[PDB]
Amino acid sequence: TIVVAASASESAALQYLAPYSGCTMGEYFRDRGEDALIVYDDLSKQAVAYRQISLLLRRPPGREAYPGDVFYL
Amino acid sequence: AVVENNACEQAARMIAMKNATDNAGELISDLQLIYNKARQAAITQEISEIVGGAAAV
Amino acid sequence: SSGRIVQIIGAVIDVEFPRDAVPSIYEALKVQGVETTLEVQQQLGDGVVRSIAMGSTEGLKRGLNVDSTGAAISVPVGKATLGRIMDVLGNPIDEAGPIGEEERWGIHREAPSYADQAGGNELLETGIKVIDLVCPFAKGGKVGLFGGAGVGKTVNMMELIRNIAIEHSGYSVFAGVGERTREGNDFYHEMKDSNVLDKVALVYGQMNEPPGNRLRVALTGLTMAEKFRDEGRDVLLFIDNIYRYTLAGTEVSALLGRMPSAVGYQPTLAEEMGVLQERITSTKKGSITSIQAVYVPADDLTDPSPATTFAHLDATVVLSRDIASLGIYPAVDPLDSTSRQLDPLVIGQDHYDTARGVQYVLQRYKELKDIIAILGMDELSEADKLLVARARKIQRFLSQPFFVAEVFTGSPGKYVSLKDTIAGFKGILNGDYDHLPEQAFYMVGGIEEAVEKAKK
Amino acid sequence: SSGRIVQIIGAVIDVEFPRDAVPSIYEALKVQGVETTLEVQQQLGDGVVRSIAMGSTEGLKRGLNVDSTGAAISVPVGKATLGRIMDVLGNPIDEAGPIGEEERWGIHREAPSYADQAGGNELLETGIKVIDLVCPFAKGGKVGLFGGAGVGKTVNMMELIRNIAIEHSGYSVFAGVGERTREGNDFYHEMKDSNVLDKVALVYGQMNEPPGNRLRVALTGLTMAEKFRDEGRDVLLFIDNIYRYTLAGTEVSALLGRMPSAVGYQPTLAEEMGVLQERITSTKKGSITSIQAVYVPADDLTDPSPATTFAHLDATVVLSRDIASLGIYPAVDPLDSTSRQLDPLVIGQDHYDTARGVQYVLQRYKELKDIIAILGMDELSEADKLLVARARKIQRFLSQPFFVAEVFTGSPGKYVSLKDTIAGFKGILNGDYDHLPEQAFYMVGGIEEAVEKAKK
Amino acid sequence: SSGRIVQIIGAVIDVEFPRDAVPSIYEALKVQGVETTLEVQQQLGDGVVRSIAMGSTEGLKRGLNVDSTGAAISVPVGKATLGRIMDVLGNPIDEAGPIGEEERWGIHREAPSYADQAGGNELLETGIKVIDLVCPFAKGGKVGLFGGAGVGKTVNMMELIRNIAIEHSGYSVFAGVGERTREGNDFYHEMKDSNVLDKVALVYGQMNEPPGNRLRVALTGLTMAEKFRDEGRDVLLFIDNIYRYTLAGTEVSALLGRMPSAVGYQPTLAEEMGVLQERITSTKKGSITSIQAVYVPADDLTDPSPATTFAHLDATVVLSRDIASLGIYPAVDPLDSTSRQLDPLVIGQDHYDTARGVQYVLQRYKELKDIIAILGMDELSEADKLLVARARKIQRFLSQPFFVAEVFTGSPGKYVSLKDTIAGFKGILNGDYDHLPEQAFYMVGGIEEAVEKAKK
């Protein structure tokens, strides 16, 4: 197992990027004819970190103050 | 004795069904207050979201 | 002339052109160096146009030169598009090299005029008991598969494609809008292995693609269907999810400088929907028969997007999460589903009386259900006890095993003709099969099978 | 160098400094004519910084000179803080003279690293039947007492201070964040008269205080506790109400120019909690057992502040207004309350089974509530009637008179061991007490007292 | 001096004036060459004022000259307004020529001061038995009127208009807040046919008028009522619907761009209600008493509009569709209708005991009627059957022939005094009339008339 950590005290940018970093580490095996499994323990916490950055960048809010592109995230 | 107890069964059932009808109304009355709170709360939230988006765009 | 990128924010890009060379609304632009296309959505003023990228912006920079093409996105149309997989820009997304096009059309167009509409009620048989009974489809009509998440929209559409497209003598367009890439691969290999890929044009814009791609994929597929309709042909148009078109507009609306409306939707929800939906129609030259899957956010049929969609369709099929939660498929709601062809002057009195008879029995049982929960079954009158039995059986007899669902059901698929659909329900309503246990009607195709399942 | 107040709006102040002398974020600033302290939150550009006042802004004006101190708010730490009362800036507020400090520490720090963490599974007996049963605590872990207004948070905390100071021999740190000033006076004199005061450090920033004080008092208490943890000591950190740290942040958020999030909260809600919550942990050098009361706005557990707090705790105790309305104290919800220590590998199978059994019984009773509400208990099945009877006895046997509540009621307090707690509930579940009236279990401490209460 | 229109956006108009000639808040402005009036709402600064058109804005353009009038909207007051229909500006909407006015008053003023209030509570003798006994009105009080259409609302207003003028030498004013043009024409003819038109002044703000007109009509009618009060009179102010006054304020607040409050109402909701309701009081010269029809949104009594209005109501009169079917035309429900004046410390022990005695008897009879229906009349005791006989006599004695209802009842009208009302009901409760038939107590006026209708 590879363990990727972005704990509660870390920058909202690191919490927003952690799932993509872990996905990239899993994709290494897929692209080379091997099998991998990935667990995202909380995508709802990744969405809350993305909402923070987006509001501080002054982008217009949506359905529960969440960014317009939270589906595409 | 049997026949008189059947008359008692019918009367007892009358009062039980009256109690059940009254109790149902109390539940309906309490739920209606919660529904009105949920109705009013939903409206305020939507307005905040409309105002919030318009204050950015 | 030439323009420079001045402002990139997400999927939205601003390009500044000479004040004498400002590109038109919906005009396509090309970035120099980077392989990216931008469609003008708004003319802000002072030579600047607001556009949406038809690709990724991770490689875009401020000051990159942009070229005006003088027209809107032009996609290939006609016979060359059959048996091919394409993107929003019409590029081939299969390894079979280039497409031999003899003409390109612009994705943006006017809807057929009021004098060009055509009216027809030819009845189209589907092979599904619930639909053939309460939602009779018609050739050249518009069908909508309304439902939330995980209730059967894709599965039901695949069964229809199989029971109609495979037999259909004419051509067909399949548009995957905001679909899972795995479903697109399974369907492509399915059309290819079934030898039917030769008569089906495939356009795919999945969930991994930029908002602009998911916002125009529906216009690309429809432009190909319109070329075939205008040749005088009969065409089938299948759209995987038309909600993704509305959602892509919501995702980009706020960055386009538009104030939000109710339930955080674009203020142009009804017009953006009408502009697409009015082109999907059967005129006096040829007939487009179309099936659209409509996602219902949080299972709430009152949400602005689903609520604005009903008025555009002839047949409305409603899938219920409460029926699916009981192991019943197809999970169509007979009391919420409707069709314009349901009229004694269009079909017949025998069919209509059977349909209204089934609906009457199920509507009355929806109120006795709570009565049975509190108190008990014993406290009901005999007519209510007798009705409760037939309602529970009819609900189960509406279930039909489908060939496309064999992977999930484990059992073989079944096809029921409308005659068997009418016969069985009429008998159950008459009470002829009141001698059969309730468990015998679950997934049993025709009523005959039910009589056999009761013996096992 | 020296700056000038350029703007004042409530508790927030903007100060302009020379471009070569701009203060860093969190740097402390002092106003020359009043000595009011300001904490820098952000740098706006052009030499202008935005700050929050650590006191009242009434009487301040534009153009006043401001001095930068070159460091963040620094507070005294170590043995000199024991038996003393301090404010947010580390000043003494007990009239007992200056603090004999040897060193000062800044109130902003980074959380201990992943490789300095420590695992605590040693059970900490509280003496309360409900907590010892379904919410077992551990040494060096975090506990949260969730509850609405007037339900039991301050009383249920004061009892745990009394029954945990029985086995603990080290130091304690208490941080009063936005609560009653009378309750701080009552607690100080109680410990002074009981001679317990020389082992407790007290920090206060109550409801009477401006937003800047209520926002930083939590950091000042934690900073003193960290000093004791890093000296290799076992410490108890008590936070009077952690929600007020977040609320003080909401009052100031719009003044800091931030766009609001759901229900008016600051966009930075989860980060502010984590930056404070992560530091409250047991490293390898020392341990910080922490108890924090969590207010629940309008009794809504789904509100963003309470909802974001659950993930930061090892044990969650959820108090309820309904349980309190029946007369039960403490009003803990066994079905909503939980702990990381409720594991067969930590507490043993016997305790884990007694708790699983008590929860199973109460859960079924909750499901039968509506039927009994309209038809009464007499229509239930024989087994259901038996469970409803054991569920009711279990409900009242979870009640306990506290030693901090004899003033309110007059009855004497009870301390119940983990052994006696398990024996009482195991007996009621097995049916060994089916012959006692329900009222023999209410406020009886041990089970033997219920047997002697049943004699009347 | 004169200004110029600078911006037009719907009903909101911005006008620019010289720096030495800016008009005041609430000042009325006149557009040159067009019959359009603008009320100033806000002073934006730099010479520009924001106003709301009191009429249509179609055909207006930028640059038109506007003239200041020096005061707020000023309307005709006094005797000349009786028997006339006027708009919000005081113009005669009836084709009866100019109003013979001697004076004009501005519609905006402060409520009477703390020193101007009357020295106690004085009942207003309406001359209607059910109202004077169960719903006593205080002079200077506010009465909420509840019920549907076709239950006698209009006839009750016409009877009150006749009695205040003939029996108390007073006058009436009717404010049609959001009046329906069809109902406004019907009411004018009904009052002419009923010979009450010369006792009342009619002010109408029709539904098709802009939000500013519907918001100010209540102040125009109130200004005419204030004049009569100063004359030395007791006056009746009828407001067609107080909910439409609240909604007009919500509409105007949204047009001016203000941030909305709870449930979407204007932030000024309580202040706008207080400014209107605090002028309606009993002074040291005269007393304006008001009858206001109340609408409840979604049947919710906790909604901000009902909640705010109920805070200013002294009595609640409920008209019942059931009572009307019985044949009691007044149709006021004696159990649901209430008054704050129904207190022995205000109306004396005698009036209070008589009214509470009638309500006690009427309550018991409603319970007994369900018994008589479910189980039968024989199941009742002798005391209960005697009570039923008095309750039926009481119920019919609550009826009364009005002078405006002679066309429907075929009998002459009656004006019963408070003294005669208390004496009549006191006797029936004690049993002094138990020998008379109940019909003898129907449509008679005072109690001596029941005794005479009996001899026959």
Ligand SMILES: Nc1ncnc2c1ncn2[C@@H]1O[C@H](COP(=O)(O)OP(=O)(O)O)[C@@H](O)[C@H]1O
């Ligand atoms: N008729 C059916 N028979 C069996 N499983 C079905 C059926 N319809 C839906 N399902 C189940 O739901 C999924 C497929 O339905 P799908 O079309 O994806 O639903 P939706 O498009 O409404 O999200 C599978 O997991 C399958 O097990």
Ligand SMILES: Nc1ncnc2c1ncn2[C@@H]1O[C@H](COP(=O)(O)OP(=O)(O)O)[C@@H](O)[C@H]1O
């Ligand atoms: N016998 C009791 N046992 C426990 N709590 C009680 C008892 N009687 C009353 N309470 C209430 O418990 C509450 C404990 O503090 P609480 O109000 O929950 O904290 P907070 O002030 O922070 O909101 C007090 O309001 C107290 O009056």
Ligand SMILES: Nc1ncnc2c1ncn2[C@@H]1O[C@H](COP(=O)(O)OP(=O)(O)O)[C@@H](O)[C@H]1O
């Ligand atoms: N006091 C009354 N005496 C006799 N008939 C009445 C009386 N009050 C109401 N009615 C009858 O009820 C009808 C409706 O009353 P009205 O005052 O016009 O109520 P609304 O204005 O809501 O329509 C009248 O036209 C008349 O037939």
Ligand SMILES: [Mg+2]
């Ligand atoms: Mg699907």
Ligand SMILES: [Mg+2]
């Ligand atoms: Mg408190």
